[PDB]
Amino acid sequence: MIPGGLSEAKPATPEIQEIVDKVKPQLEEKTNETYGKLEAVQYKTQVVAGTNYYIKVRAGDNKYMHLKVFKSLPGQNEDLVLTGYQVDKNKDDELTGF
Amino acid sequence: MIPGGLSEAKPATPEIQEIVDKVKPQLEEKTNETYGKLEAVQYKTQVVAGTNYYIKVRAGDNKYMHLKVFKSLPGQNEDLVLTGYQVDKNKDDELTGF
């Protein structure tokens, strides 16, 4: 529906305490100051989306094609670009990040 | 709310037939192979995801720091890049478009 939404805010995780532990040297140079005790507090997560397109197409009873087109901006059909494409495999071929 | 996965399979939309019609010459040039008639059949859509992070973590002497870290691919410690940070402000500072 809506790409780019914040997840639940967790008050501290083992990964969040690891993020501060990696960011303390870079933050210390940019702040001109030493931070005291670094303890995990509360993080959220935003997921960005894009749109990849996978098509099944009938060549005759002997052949059947898959197609793969990347799109960026909606409202322009000419922005469709072929980035992947599968062969003569049947309609039984499931379109699965091929 | 919803897991990733391909969208609904439409058995030959007017967009599906237009995508294969435009990719019929490009498929035959890239494979060097001649295909008979390509008619629309069933396509599915594909959702890519990217993950930005918004963290709070109290590293002050008496203070609280809050920073967001953008990452590309998971399983890489060098992929975790600090792009945005907050200082000595408390848990009241919400990580918002940042």
Residue B8 is encoded by which pair of tokens?
């609904």
Contacting residues for A88 by C-beta, under 8 A, at least 6 apart: A59, A62, A63, A64, A65
Contact A55 B87 (CB under 8 A): no
Strand blocks (E) in chain B:
39-54, 57-60, 66-71, 80-86
Contacting residues for B29 by C-beta, under 8 A, at least 6 apart: none
Strand partners, B68: B54, B84
Which chain B residues are Cβ-neighbours of A56 within 8 angstroms? Answer: 9, 41-43
Residues A56/A12, Cβ–Cβ less than 8 Å = no
Contacting residues for A32 by C-beta, under 8 A, at least 6 apart: none
- Options 3.10.450.10, 3.40.50.2300, 3.30.70.1290, 3.10.450.710; CATH for A1-98 is 3.10.450.10
Find the closest chain A residue to B26 by CA distance: A82
3-state helix, strand, coil in chain B (%, to 5): 20, 35, 45
Calculate Rg over the CA atoms of chain A: 23
Residue A16 is encoded by which pair of tokens?
């969040």
Distance from the A89 Cα atom to the nearest Cα atom in chain B, whole angstroms: 13
